Design a protein around this ligand. Structure first.
Ligand SMILES: CCCCCCCCCCCCCCCCCC(=O)OC[C@H](COP(=O)([O-])OCC(O)COP(=O)([O-])OC[C@@H](COC(=O)CCCCCCCCCCCCCCCCC)OC(=O)CCCCCCCCCCCCCCCCC)OC(=O)CCCCCCCCCCCCCCCCC
Ligand SMILES: CCCCCCCCCCCCCCCCCC(=O)OC[C@H](COP(=O)([O-])OCC(O)COP(=O)([O-])OC[C@@H](COC(=O)CCCCCCCCCCCCCCCCC)OC(=O)CCCCCCCCCCCCCCCCC)OC(=O)CCCCCCCCCCCCCCCCC
Ligand SMILES: CCCCCCCCCCCCCCCCCC(=O)OC[C@H](COP(=O)([O-])OCC(O)COP(=O)([O-])OC[C@@H](COC(=O)CCCCCCCCCCCCCCCCC)OC(=O)CCCCCCCCCCCCCCCCC)OC(=O)CCCCCCCCCCCCCCCCC
Ligand SMILES: CCCCCCCCCCCCCCCCCC(=O)OC[C@H](COP(=O)([O-])OCC(O)COP(=O)([O-])OC[C@@H](COC(=O)CCCCCCCCCCCCCCCCC)OC(=O)CCCCCCCCCCCCCCCCC)OC(=O)CCCCCCCCCCCCCCCCC
Ligand code: HEA
Ligand code: HEA
Ligand SMILES: CCCCCCCC/C=C\CCCCCCCC(=O)OC[C@H](COP(=O)(O)OCCN)OC(=O)CCCCCCCCCCCCCCC
Ligand SMILES: CCc1nc2ccc(Cl)cn2c1C(=O)NCc1ccc(N2CCC(c3ccc(OC(F)(F)F)cc3)CC2)cc1
Ligand SMILES: CCCCCCCCCCCCCCCC(=O)O
Ligand SMILES: [Cu+2]
Lengths: 139, 552, 76, 67, 186, 220, 145
């Protein structure tokens, strides 16, 4: 993919420019020197876009043309078998209930509720991860 | 040859057809419907709070409310209306019509979708359930300023629920953004490159990037605040730089938030205009570049909300907001150009889009007026600011959302909403809105600051409050035609037995059966431009679309 | 069994799957009457009777809508 | 300002405006075709309506009558 | 069809970027309130024992190489090498977090607390969240090993192993940054 | 398990209390969880007494008759059901709870009633730990006692029928595998897997329901 | 190689993709909606209680009327187990056709009843109303088998 990488490179360039400009303009002309709270956010949003753009760049350099990236193409090119898309599942609502229990146990300071919520989150996430890998029962 | 049909399609459906499919679903269409319904319920709740506020603000004197109850009212109104109605409605429209527009069978991660929806719902319910506490809900502002939300001040048990509900909702939103980015990048039709996809999809991609940048820092700030409230963590004391630290963090979050809830509705209206103008979208790549520019600039202006503290570098942020004012102008001009010299027909989506245009123009004018420091030195923290952001918020979310509903109701249901009720609804909304929020500019220019529960009769401005509350009640009554229309037209109402009930459609979603099948597609057309359905239904038009595409 | 149709309840011959509608209607009416009479012995307050009357009115409205729609043939 | 008239406006203006707008808009003609009356001829295309109920050319009988 | 650029990889990458922004917020909390306390800004009752902060950093750095060897053995279809390397990684990550807990105990024993100081607050809140992320990574390791145990090895298992691996690499390098900021710059 | 939780968890520490004296009292006065419904019923029942000639009928009489009515309605249920449904045959095969929607809804309603009565017994603990008013909890219980059972009945009925429909769908078609194809003329199908024989054109012939559970995941 | 009247287009499958201008419908039935609904639940619930598709035809029969009616009956999905009711408001003619599979179930004792009810209701100018009455009586007559 060539255009996504270019988008992220544009964003990273602008963010780095803005971060450096803000840092050096608040080093002077400011009440107490460098501002130290917007500077950090700016360098690390630069780092975010940089990470994403670099990953996309490597994947693009390690890839041959794709029917999506390619113009000139027809629908007989993508004829094949896509991945695995999960049909019906009921684990998400249980995960959300467990996380909400832990959150309300953290709002009102109740340690037992926090412990129960964490245990339920571990259980529900385990159920979600193993859903399509449990084998038949051994009897 | 004759061919058998039914006298009328089935109204409701069998018994037991929905409740179990609602819990274990993974398809994006049902999840988008659920999004929309619950977000409108929360909209009604917030509006009720606003009506209580108005009916108290008329008639000087505390007639039936208190000071605490008024503070809780405006806090919860702001919180609900911004975080439990707009941010999820964005993902509602996304889940509805993004995979259809890119030609995909499903979203990238189908269970993360349902996880996001349920996280949103339960976080909202947690945050709202502070009213059953005897002390009440959160009583600080929507913004939760620096030492007022401490443990000494604001000691109740509503602030805790506020914080935790916001944290859960933010987690849900981050997951939704991840899913949308991955879906737009990977799953895509075998013919369309990224410079052929519709503008709605591009706006959604950019908004998801902004979400990923913005929300984690809010979760960090909220965890710091909860640590400070439950452990005495000396993080935000004014003794340290604790008063300005919170403001910097919060506003670095909070401006990207308003742009997040602004961009996709620009997309919606830019997608409705060409269908009813019978023309192409004016300046495709120009609109894409304007969107990218607004996105890049939205994160480096966060401090134009902190002029009156006397602790920021004013020229930097003032100049850069003046700068961000430009791409919105080019976007506006491209819309007006797309409407220029076409064949206009004003059905309800077009009508709501024109209303959006007018209201957003006035709001943006007031905002760019607000962006200069020596003027914000007077009009900040007054009702001028309230009028401004109510213009922009209303004109964007409310009008573009009603437009999107009236536009995509057939593509998700197979029925048609009534049009006389739609026109009545639009005119009621327009009149009530412009009569409830127009006088507040004058009301705030002369001294009347925001967040007051009472005032004295010796002061002025007692007639303007009466006009504003009359307008608020008109706006409140304007919602009955819409819910009646939706309640009747979902079961009865003229069925749609064709594709593209609004002729001259685009965007590859008007090339599949009106209620789309599971997996959304039974065949795809050959993709050569950004109007594939138009070239599919009118094949005698490609020569004329390629010949005269550059006159201008 | 007394009788429902299989296209409504697929497993209609495997177990009890029908309860008469008069039972539900008159039960709703009786529960509304109970909610209404539960405010006898007014113990220094009226925040509670607002809720009582609201819930009773909602129940009566639901029962009335169902009865009226069944009487005119809009349901079965 | 004269509490009675404040309440009066707040309670009366919205409903009055609703009334005028409803009488303006809700009394027009919808896009539905107006009913067919059997005194006049039948010009619509032929109509065949099935039942669809039971999921999945020798005649057995017949009858007639001409009104 | 299958559009070779993997999907789980893109998802994990974008989520890792968001988590980086979370840690950005924490860092911004730390840097302010350090420009306020003048002079010996670590108050006198605190002394950072360096003789124990270096070993745990080195065991984490070595665990990175162990995880990389595991994913190497994963990309070719044999599970037992994956299991051995990931068990090693789990063990030494557990050792790291145990050492961190020991330092917390010995530090609160005669000095800093969360409600006692501002430096104590920023220090504990900057290191405890990283500890929580490490614990989440350990739980992920356990779940992945069990899933490899319960059925046949296919490419999906390899993808899961890869994404868990470089999530762990992310947590490792962000710890490197935290450590170099807290202990050496001061 | 009993030894472990009798060694590690503490129950009834009588020494923290004192000997019984008719003049002193404490704040948590609950019985063990199998009498909490009796206590809750006594808490949320309104004060209705009758005073006639030279006599008095107090309020707890109501608790007495309601308790007795419950204890009489429990053992006499099979005869009620056989009188109402009119089925008197021998049965040795069990029913799945989803095949009998009305009885499942009745049972869910009774369980909801029991849960409301049990939670109405820990009013003090709930109102103290979770910051809620005490009068609020009393009225919440008093109203839930009437509006929660029917709501639960409705939802349980609809849920049972939904489960039945989900079973019939996998009987008619095959088991969904979750794999998607693109079918060179741009169509998406989902590759079901049949449970029995197939017809000439590849579609499976529908089976008949036999009261037994059906698989839903391909890995089972 | 057909005309495809200005908006229709044949896709890669056999499906037709039609469109409509913003201000029209796609049914054009000269009857009210609240009578179409009634005719529909009649046609459905009477077909449940009889195990036989019921159909209704309204176009012209400009030939030997019974011939044309049995010509039309071959368009129901399972014509052999089906009951059709044809009506031509210009020729003022009623025709009821059966299938071979639906017979011996009390049908010819009910067809003249339905025809007479439909005629008696048509003699005032109620088309949908007489159709409803006839479908009701014929569905109540036929027995399941
Ligand atoms: C606050 C919490 C209080 C804690 C209480 C006390 C804790 C004790 C644990 C509870 C009971 C212990 C079970 C003892 C059996 C252990 C022996 C065993 O390995 O059997 C394998 C057993 C296979 O049973 P099988 O008969 O061969 O059937 C195989 C089929 O494929 C069946 O496949 P399936 O499709 O039908 O679904 C499989 C299902 C089967 O698992 C279960 O159903 C267990 C839960 C049933 C409890 C009752 C539910 C009540 C809810 C209402 O499991 C799941 O659905 C996924 C959930 C993840 C469970 C493991 C996560 C542990 C969280 C630790 C924190 O799998 C399990 O049950 C594992 C669960 C326990 C994990 C091992 C113990 C670790 C404990 C903590 C470690 C630190
Ligand atoms: C671009 C597109 C535009 C999007 C939409 C536009 C947005 C505009 C805003 C909407 C404006 C007004 C909406 C009017 C609705 C229209 C009615 C209609 O005819 O549509 C029927 C339409 C046709 O349904 P069907 O699948 O064809 O067949 C229905 C079966 O006949 C029957 O299915 P069943 O037998 O399996 O049971 C279904 C059950 C569903 O039960 C529930 O949903 C219970 C929770 C809802 C109320 C909870 C409040 C407390 O329904 C009922 O409970 C019966 C009456 C509802 C009770 C409401 C009480 C009124 C007071 O239904 C829908 O498609 C709606 C889709 C999703 C709506 C529900 C979303 C709920 C989300 C989660 C709820 C969980 C909350 C948990 C917390 C509280 C605990 C309870
Ligand atoms: C802070 C919030 C943490 C957010 C959690 C992370 C979200 C990651 C989303 C990015 C990619 C989405 C994805 O891959 O879909 C997998 C799956 C979505 O399934 P799907 O939509 O059907 O698509 C299937 C894929 O095609 C194919 O999916 P797959 O079956 O091949 O699985 C891919 C892989 C998933 O790949 C990964 O993303 C690995 C990431 C490492 C997890 C580290 C998170 C720890 C958070 C730090 C704690 C603070 O799964 C694994 O290998 C095992 C992951 C084990 C998760 C461990 C979570 C433990 C949390 C408990 C914390 C307690 C300790 C603190 C006290 O979502 C998950 O399994 C993640 C669990 C999310 C639960 C939320 C927790 C609340
Ligand atoms: C033309 C249309 C336009 C007209 C415009 C208006 C027309 C009238 C206006 C009047 C005022 C209108 C106000 C209401 C607005 C209606 C809105 C509405 O309902 O939703 C539309 C619409 C309503 O559907 P519908 O057209 O009425 O069709 C209903 C069914 O198809 C068919 O219903 P069904 O025949 O199946 O009947 C169901 C129901 C029957 O219907 C009713 O009568 C309702 C009654 C309600 C209260 C009854 C409670 C009984 C309590 C007694 C206590 C025990 C006795 O039966 C029940 O399940 C009720 C539960 C009672 C259980 C009692 C059994 C007791 C067994 C023995 C116990 C004895 C011992 C006692 C011991 C107690 C403790 C242990 O909603 C939908 O179709 C689906 C909604 C899909 C999603 C929407 C949800 C959005 C949520 C947003 C968040
Ligand atoms: C959903 C949206 C939303 C949008 C889009 C905006 C858009 C803008 N906002 Fe607004 N704003 C809010 C929501 C929004 N705002 C909220 C909620 C608050 C305060 C909340 C709180 O404090 O509690 C707020 C507060 C706020 C403030 C500070 C108020 C304070 O003092 O407290 C300022 C100025 O600094 C500001 C400026 C702007 C500017 C410059 C734009 C620009 O984006 C708009 C530019 C738009 C145009 C329409 C220009 C039209 C273009 C052409 C026609 C070319 C014209 C050219 C010239 C005149 C040069 N906003
Ligand atoms: C996206 C957002 C959004 C929307 C839609 C609104 C909508 C409205 N707002 Fe709000 N508002 C804010 C965002 C929004 N607001 C923010 C951010 C603030 C300031 C925050 C703060 O200071 O902290 C604010 C503050 C604010 C104030 C001043 C508070 C203060 O004093 O400072 C006022 C009133 O003057 C007001 C009025 C209104 C009115 C009249 C509407 C009308 O649009 C709404 C009309 C709505 C309805 C009436 C709903 C209809 C309801 C019924 C039909 C009742 C039915 C009930 C049931 C079925 C439950 N808003
Ligand atoms: C919010 C999380 C913030 C930070 C987490 C990292 C913890 C860092 C651990 C180090 C603590 C320390 O060393 O501080 C010693 C002090 C001495 O204070 P004292 O008064 O003198 O002693 C008298 C004690 N009563 O004890 C303490 O504050 C106790 C610390 C409390 C433990 C941390 C809480 C974890 C809860 C997790 C929340 C999960 C909720 C999820 C829901 C969405
Ligand atoms: C209100 C309950 C309660 N409040 C509190 C408060 C604090 C604490 Cl710590 C505990 N509680 C409890 C409590 O412990 N409840 C359990 C309980 C309830 C009732 C009965 N009664 C026994 C026999 C009677 C009886 C006897 C003869 C009869 O024969 C006749 F007359 F012919 F019918 C009928 C009934 C009724 C039930 C025992 C235990
Ligand atoms: C039906 C659900 C209700 C939702 C929450 C409603 C909140 C009502 C608040 C008023 C109750 C009394 C508040 C404190 C006393 C006053 O004074
Ligand atoms: Cu300000």
């Amino acid at each position: 993919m060539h255009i996504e990488a270019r988008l992220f490179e544009i964003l990273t360039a602008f963010f780095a420019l803005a971060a450096v400009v803000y840092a050096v303009l608040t080093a002077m002309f400011a009440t107490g020197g460098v501002e130290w709270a917007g500077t950090t956010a700016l360098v690390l949003t630069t780092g975010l876009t940089l990470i994403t753009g670099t990953f996309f760049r490597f994947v693009a350099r390690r890839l041959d043309t794709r029917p999506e990236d390619y113009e000139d193409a027809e629908i007989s090119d993508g004829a094949g078998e896509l991945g695995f898309f999960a049909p019906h599942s009921w684990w998400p609502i249980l995960i959300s209930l467990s996380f909400s229990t832990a959150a309300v146990g953290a709002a009102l300071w109740l340690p037992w509720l926090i412990a129960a919520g964490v245990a339920f989150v571990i259980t529900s996430v385990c159920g979600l991860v193993f859903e399509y890998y449990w084998g038949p029962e051994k009897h | 040859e004759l061919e058998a049909r039914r006298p009328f399609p089935e109204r409701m459906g069998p018994k037991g057809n929905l409740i179990y499919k609602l819990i274990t679903t993974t398809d994006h269409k049902l999840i988008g419907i659920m999004y929309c319904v619950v977000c409108f319920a929360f909209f009604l709740v917030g509006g009720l709070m606003a009506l209580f506020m108005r009916t108290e603000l008329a008639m000087p004197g505390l007639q039936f409310l208190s000071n605490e109850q008024f503070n809780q009212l405006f806090t919860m109104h702001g919180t609900v209306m911004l975080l439990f109605y707009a941010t999820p409605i964005v993902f509602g429209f996304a889940n509805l019509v993004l995979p259809l527009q890119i030609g995909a069978p499903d979203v990238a991660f189908p269970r993360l979708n349902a996880l996001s929806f349920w996280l949103f719902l339960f976080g909202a319910l947690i945050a709202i359930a502070g009213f059953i506490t005897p002390g009440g809900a959160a009583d600080f502002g929507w913004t939760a300023y620096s030492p007022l939300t401490d443990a000494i001040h604001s000691p109740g048990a509503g602030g805790d629920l506020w914080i935790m509900g916001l944290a859960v909702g933010g987690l849900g939103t981050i997951l939704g953004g991840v899913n949308m980015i991955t879906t737009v990048v990977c799953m895509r039709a075998p013919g369309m490159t990224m410079f052929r996809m519709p503008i709605f999809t591009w706006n959604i991609l950019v908004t998801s990037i902004l979400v990923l940048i913005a929300f984690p820092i809010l979760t960090a700030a909220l965890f710091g605040l909860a640590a400070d409230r439950h452990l005495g963590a000396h993080i935000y004391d004014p003794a340290n730089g604790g008063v300005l630290l919170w403001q910097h963090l919060f506003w670095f979050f909070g401006h990207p938030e308003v742009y997040i809830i602004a961009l996709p509705f620009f997309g919606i209206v830019s997608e409705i205009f060409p269908v009813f103008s019978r023309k192409p979208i004016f300046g495709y790549t120009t609109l894409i570049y304007a969107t990218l520019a607004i996105a890049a600039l939205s994160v480096a202006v966060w401090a134009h909300h902190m002029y009156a503290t006397g602790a920021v570098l004013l020229p930097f942020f003032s100049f850069m907001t003046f700068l961000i004012a430009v791409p919105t102008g080019i976007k506006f001009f491209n819309w007006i150009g797309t409407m220029w010299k076409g064949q206009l027909t004003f059905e309800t989506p077009m009508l709501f889009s024109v209303g959006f245009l007018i209201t957003f123009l006035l709001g943006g004018l007031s905002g760019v007026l607000l962006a200069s420091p020596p003027l914000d030195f007077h009009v900040t923290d007054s009702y001028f600011v309230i009028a401004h952001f109510h213009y922009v918020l209303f004109g964007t979310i409310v009008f573009a959302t009603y437009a999107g509903i009236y536009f995509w109701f057939p593509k998700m249901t197979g029925r048609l909403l009534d049009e006389r009720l739609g026109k009545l609804h639009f005119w009621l909304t327009f009149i009530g809105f412009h009569t409830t929020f127009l006088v507040q500019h004058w009301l705030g220019d002369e001294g009347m600051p925001r967040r007051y529960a009472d005032y004295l009769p010796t002061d002025g401005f007692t007639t303007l409050n009466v006009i504003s509350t009359v307008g608020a009640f008109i706006l409140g009554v304007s919602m009955l035609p819409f819910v009646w229309n939706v309640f009747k037209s979902w079961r009865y109402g003229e069925p749609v037995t064709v594709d593209d009930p609004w002729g001259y459609g685009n965007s590859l979603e008007w090339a599949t059966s009106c209620p789309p099948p599971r997996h959304n597609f039974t065949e795809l057309p050959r993709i050569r431009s950004e109007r594939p359905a138009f070239e599919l239904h009118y094949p005698h038009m490609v020569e004329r679309m390629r010949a005269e595409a550059h006159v201008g | 069994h007394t009788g429902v149709d299989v296209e409504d309840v697929p497993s209609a011959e495997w177990g009890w799957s029908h309860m008469p509608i008069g039972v539900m209607h008159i039960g709703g009416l009786l529960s509304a009457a109970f909610l209404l009479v539960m405010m006898r012995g007014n113990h220094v307050g009226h925040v509670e009777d607002w809720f009582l009357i609201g819930f009773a009115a909602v129940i009566v409205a639901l029962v009335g809508r169902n009865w009226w729609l069944r009487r005119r043939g809009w349901i079965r | 300002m004269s509490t009675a008239l404040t309440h009066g406006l707040i309670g009366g203006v919205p409903l009055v405006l609703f009334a005028v707008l409803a009488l303006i808009f809700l009394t027009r003609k919808g896009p539905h075709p107006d009913t067919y009356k059997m005194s006049d001829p039948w010009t619509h295309a032929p109509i065949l309506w099935a039942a669809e109920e039971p999921r999945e050319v020798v005649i057995g009988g017949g009858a007639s009558g001409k009104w | 069809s299958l559009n070779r650029p993997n999907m789980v990889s893109v998802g994990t990458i974008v989520w890792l970027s968001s988590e980086l922004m979370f840690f950005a917020g924490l860092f911004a909390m730390y840097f302010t309130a350090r420009a306020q306390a003048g002079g010996a800004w670590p108050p006198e009752p605190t002394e950072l024992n360096l003789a124990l902060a270096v070993p745990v950093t080195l065991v984490l750095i070595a665990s990175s190489f162990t995880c990389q060897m595991g994913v190497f053995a994963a990309e070719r279809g044999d599970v037992f090498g994956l299991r051995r390397w990931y068990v090693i990684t789990f063990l030494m990550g557990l050792f790291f977090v145990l050492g961190q807990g020991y330092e917390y105990i010995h530090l609160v024993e005669h000095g800093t607390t969360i409600p006692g100081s501002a430096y104590g607050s920023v220090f504990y809140l900057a290191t405890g969240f990283h500890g929580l992320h490490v614990i989440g990574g350990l739980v992920a390791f356990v779940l992945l090993l069990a899933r490899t145990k319960m059925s046949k090895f296919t490419p999906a298992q390899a993808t899961a192993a890869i994404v868990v691996s470089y999530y762990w690499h992310f947590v490792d390098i962000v710890w490197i940054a935290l450590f170099a900021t807290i202990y050496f710059v001061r | 398990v009993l030894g472990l939780m009798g060694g590690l968890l503490q129950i009834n520490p009588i020494w923290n209390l004192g000997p019984y004296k008719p003049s002193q009292v404490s704040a948590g006065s609950q019985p063990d969880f199998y009498m909490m419904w009796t206590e809750g019923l006594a808490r949320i029942w309104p004060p209705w007494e009758f005073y006639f000639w030279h006599h008095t009928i107090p309020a707890p009489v109501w608790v007495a008759v309601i308790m007795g009515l419950v204890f009489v309605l429990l053992p006499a249920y099979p005869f009620l059901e056989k009188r109402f449904t009119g089925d008197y045959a021998h049965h040795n095969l069990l029913q799945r709870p989803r095949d009998v929607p009305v009885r499942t809804a009745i049972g869910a309603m009774a369980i909801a009633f029991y849960m409301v009565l049990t939670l109405a017994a820990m009013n003090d603990i709930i109102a103290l730990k979770f910051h809620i008013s005490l009068n609020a909890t009393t009225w919440i219980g008093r109203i839930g006692m009437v509006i929660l059972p029917p709501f639960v009945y409705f939802i349980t009925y609809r849920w049972c029928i939904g489960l039945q429909r989900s079973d019939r769908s996998v009987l008619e078609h095959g088991v969904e595998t979750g794999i998607i194809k693109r079918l060179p003329h741009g169509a998406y199908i989902e590759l079901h897997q049949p449970l029995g024989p197939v017809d000439e054109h590849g579609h499976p012939i529908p089976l008949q329901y036999q009261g037994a559970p059906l698989p839903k995941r391909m890995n089972k | 190689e057909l005309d495809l009247p200005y908006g229709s287009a044949l896709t890669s499958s056999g499906r037709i993709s039609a469109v409509t201008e913003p201000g029209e419908l796609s049914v054009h039935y000269p009857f009210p909606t609240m009578d179409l609904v009634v005719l529909d639940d009649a046609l459905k619930y009477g077909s449940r209680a009889a195990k036989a598709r019921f159909a209704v035809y309204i176009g012209p029969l400009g030939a030997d009327t019974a011939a044309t009616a049995r010509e039309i009956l071959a368009n129901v999905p399972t014509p052999e187990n089906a009951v059709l009711l044809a009506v031509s408001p210009d020729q003022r003619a009623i025709e009821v056709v059966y299938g071979a599979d639906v017979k011996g179930r009390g049908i010819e004792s009910a067809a003249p009843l339905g025809v007479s009810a439909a005629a008696a209701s048509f003699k005032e100018g109620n088309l949908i109303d007489g159709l409803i009455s006839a479908v009701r009586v014929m569905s109540a007559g036929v027995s399941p088998a």
